[PDB]
Structure formats: C-alpha cells, structure tokens
Design an enzyme around this catalytic site. Structure first.
Site, PDB file in Angstrom:
ATOM      1  N   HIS A  73      35.694  62.096  65.593  1.00  0.00           N
ATOM      2  CA  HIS A  73      36.667  62.602  64.648  1.00  0.00           C
ATOM      3  C   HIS A  73      36.653  61.856  63.285  1.00  0.00           C
ATOM      4  O   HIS A  73      37.323  62.222  62.336  1.00  0.00           O
ATOM      5  CB  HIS A  73      38.071  62.657  65.312  1.00  0.00           C
ATOM      6  CG  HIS A  73      38.849  61.356  65.321  1.00  0.00           C
ATOM      7  ND1 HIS A  73      38.918  60.532  66.423  1.00  0.00           N
ATOM      8  CD2 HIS A  73      39.710  60.821  64.414  1.00  0.00           C
ATOM      9  CE1 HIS A  73      39.778  59.549  66.206  1.00  0.00           C
ATOM     10  NE2 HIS A  73      40.275  59.701  64.995  1.00  0.00           N
ATOM     11  N   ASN A 105      39.051  41.014  53.929  1.00  0.00           N
ATOM     12  CA  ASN A 105      39.855  41.742  52.966  1.00  0.00           C
ATOM     13  C   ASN A 105      38.976  42.903  52.456  1.00  0.00           C
ATOM     14  O   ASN A 105      37.968  42.660  51.761  1.00  0.00           O
ATOM     15  CB  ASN A 105      40.271  40.814  51.840  1.00  0.00           C
ATOM     16  CG  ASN A 105      41.349  41.409  50.994  1.00  0.00           C
ATOM     17  OD1 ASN A 105      42.383  40.782  50.751  1.00  0.00           O
ATOM     18  ND2 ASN A 105      41.159  42.622  50.570  1.00  0.00           N
ATOM     19  N   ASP A 157      34.910  61.962  72.205  1.00  0.00           N
ATOM     20  CA  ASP A 157      35.155  61.530  70.796  1.00  0.00           C
ATOM     21  C   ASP A 157      34.297  60.240  70.512  1.00  0.00           C
ATOM     22  O   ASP A 157      34.763  59.054  70.522  1.00  0.00           O
ATOM     23  CB  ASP A 157      36.666  61.272  70.597  1.00  0.00           C
ATOM     24  CG  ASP A 157      37.019  61.018  69.148  1.00  0.00           C
ATOM     25  OD1 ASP A 157      36.190  61.303  68.288  1.00  0.00           O
ATOM     26  OD2 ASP A 157      38.108  60.518  68.849  1.00  0.00           O
ATOM     27  N   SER A 174      47.313  50.711  68.528  1.00  0.00           N
ATOM     28  CA  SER A 174      46.474  50.933  67.353  1.00  0.00           C
ATOM     29  C   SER A 174      47.135  52.169  66.602  1.00  0.00           C
ATOM     30  O   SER A 174      48.125  52.802  67.081  1.00  0.00           O
ATOM     31  CB  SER A 174      45.039  51.198  67.782  1.00  0.00           C
ATOM     32  OG  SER A 174      44.971  52.279  68.657  1.00  0.00           O
ATOM     33  N   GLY A 211      43.797  55.010  60.912  1.00  0.00           N
ATOM     34  CA  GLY A 211      43.061  54.059  60.114  1.00  0.00           C
ATOM     35  C   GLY A 211      42.311  53.121  61.041  1.00  0.00           C
ATOM     36  O   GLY A 211      41.342  52.511  60.633  1.00  0.00           O
ATOM     37  N   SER A 224      41.180  54.273  63.858  1.00  0.00           N
ATOM     38  CA  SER A 224      40.308  55.251  64.531  1.00  0.00           C
ATOM     39  C   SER A 224      38.832  54.913  64.416  1.00  0.00           C
ATOM     40  O   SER A 224      38.372  54.527  63.343  1.00  0.00           O
ATOM     41  CB  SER A 224      40.545  56.679  63.963  1.00  0.00           C
ATOM     42  OG  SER A 224      41.850  56.735  63.418  1.00  0.00           O
ATOM     43  N   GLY A 225      38.107  55.063  65.507  1.00  0.00           N
ATOM     44  CA  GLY A 225      36.674  54.784  65.550  1.00  0.00           C
ATOM     45  C   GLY A 225      36.384  53.321  65.859  1.00  0.00           C
ATOM     46  O   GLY A 225      35.261  52.992  66.213  1.00  0.00           O
TER      47      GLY A 225
HETATM   48  C1  LIG Z   1      43.652  60.847  66.078  1.00  0.00           C
HETATM   49  P1  LIG Z   1      44.030  59.373  65.020  1.00  0.00           P
HETATM   50  O1  LIG Z   1      42.730  58.708  64.506  1.00  0.00           O
HETATM   51  O2  LIG Z   1      44.888  59.740  63.805  1.00  0.00           O
HETATM   52  C2  LIG Z   1      44.974  58.204  66.062  1.00  0.00           C
HETATM   53  C3  LIG Z   1      44.335  57.044  66.691  1.00  0.00           C
HETATM   54  C4  LIG Z   1      45.115  56.182  67.507  1.00  0.00           C
HETATM   55  C5  LIG Z   1      46.513  56.437  67.701  1.00  0.00           C
HETATM   56  C6  LIG Z   1      47.325  55.543  68.561  1.00  0.00           C
HETATM   57  N1  LIG Z   1      46.762  54.552  69.153  1.00  0.00           N
HETATM   58  N2  LIG Z   1      48.606  55.756  68.728  1.00  0.00           N
HETATM   59  C7  LIG Z   1      47.150  57.569  67.075  1.00  0.00           C
HETATM   60  C8  LIG Z   1      46.384  58.448  66.263  1.00  0.00           C
HETATM   61 CA   LIG Z   2      35.686  42.184  51.347  1.00  0.00          CA
END
Ligand SMILES: CP(=O)(O)c1ccc(C(=N)N)cc1
Ligand SMILES: [Ca+2]
Length: 223
Positions: A40, A54, A84, A172, A175, A177-178
C-alpha cells in the site's frame, strides 16, 4: 508511533524512509540492494533514504538512492490489504557499515508473546496530528491469533498478525506504514493497518513476513 520513545540516532540501522519529495512510508533494508515495504506504500519515483535519524536535517550518515524497480506481491488485494508487501530494488548498492545494516529474514514464524521492536516517523498522536522529525521506537508483543481475530472479526487472514496492547495507548500509526517489526533480530512484520491508532481493542495489524520468504528470495535471485 504513538506512545513510544526516541530510538536514538542510527540505533535501528535497517530502517529506511521512502521519499517522494517528502517522507511517505518506512521500509527495511534486507541486503545491499533491496528494500521490503508495504504494497500500500507503492508509488513511482521513490527515492530510498538510508541512515536517517532527523528526516529534515542532513546529519552526515545518509545515503539517498533511487529505486530502479519495485515489485508489488502478485496477490496483493488493496481492498482487504491481504499480502500487503512490496520489494524495491535500489539503482546501486548501499554501503553497509555499523549505522546502515541489513536485517535478516526469518527462518521461522514468531510466536504470540514474543516482544518486538516497531519503528517509524509516523504520527505520534491518537487524536490530532503531530509528525516527529526523528525516529520513534515501540516495544510491543505479538498477540494471539484469537484475540487478533476477536478485535477484527472477518478481517484477519493467515498473512496477518496483531501486535500491540489491547488496552490502547501504544501503537504504530499513519506514516509508519511499510516499516519494520523485528523480533529477536529477524524481520517478522511490516506495518500494515489498524482502526485509527492506539485505540482500546484495536491493536496494529502487520504483514506476516515468514510466509513470504520464498517469494522474496526467489524474486531477488532473478531480478
Ligand atoms: C493503512 P495505514 O498505513 O494508514 C495504517 C498503519 C498502521 C495503523 C495502526 N497501527 N493503527 C493504522 C493505519
Ligand atoms: Ca537526515
């Protein structure tokens, strides 16, 4: 990452930021030329940034490398988020040192109860929005498949696991994600989905990497 702590610069060496003009997803370095992320997170024009703490300041340990190719899993379903997982090949190999290192692929699936490290630059709040500049970390256990299936009826497939706290407050988020979920020094999951972040009884859902080891190895052996 909601409810976690500041990792410390370059203490998670396999963590990468996928940049398309701005940070949009995390990923994990699995050898000098390949990155694993969430399908995704797919987009064209990905520049992979390694050695980041940073993401808004050049601190001296970064390697920015463009992707030459990305491969979304053959069976990825964007409606259900089943399978995914995506592979990104870098244009040139990264230079590996103590601050930029690959993470080993699992030889076995990890068990409910195992404590893991989840990291990323995603949102740090469950209500508003606040994105950190430096890498955040969270230690969380893998949950049993029953509680996972109990939290998300009719949605968890055999290619997913839950990790987190049913009580809420730690998870998590968008942001992240992945990004990686590493347990006992092996990559076991990929930050995938969840309802909102850190809500009571809505733990995070992760792609189950151990199921894809054969697909990863042979894809990298032929590309
Ligand atoms: C599909 P996404 O990338 O927006 C995402 C990923 C993780 C969560 C979580 N750990 N609650 C929620 C949404
Ligand atoms: Ca940096």
């Amino acid at each position: 990452i909601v409810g976690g702590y500041t990792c410390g610069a370059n203490t998670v060496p396999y963590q990468v930021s996928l940049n398309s003009g701005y940070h949009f997803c995390g990923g994990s370095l699995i050898n000098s030329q390949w990155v694993v992320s969430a399908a995704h997170c797919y987009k064209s024009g990905i520049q992979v940034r390694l050695g980041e703490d940073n993401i808004n300041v050049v601190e001296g340990n970064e390697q920015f490398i463009s992707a030459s190719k990305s491969i979304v899993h053959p069976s990825y379903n964007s409606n259900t988020l089943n399978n995914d997982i995506m592979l990104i090949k870098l244009k040139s190999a990264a230079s590996l040192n103590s601050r930029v290192a690959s993470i080993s692929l699992p030889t076995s699936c990890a068990s409910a109860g195992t404590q893991c490290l989840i990291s990323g630059w995603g949102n740090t709040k469950s209500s508003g929005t606040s994105y950190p500049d430096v890498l955040k970390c969270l230690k969380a256990p893998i949950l049993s498949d029953s509680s996972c299936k109990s939290a998300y009826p009719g949605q968890i497939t055999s290619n997913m696991f839950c990790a987190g706290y049913l009580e809420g407050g730690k998870d998590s988020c968008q942001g992240d994600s992945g990004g990686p979920v590493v347990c006992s020094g092996k990559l076991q999951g990929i930050v995938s989905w969840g309802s909102g972040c850190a809500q009571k009884n809505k733990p995070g859902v992760y792609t189950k990497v151990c199921n894809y080891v054969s697909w990863i190895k042979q894809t990298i052996a032929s590309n």
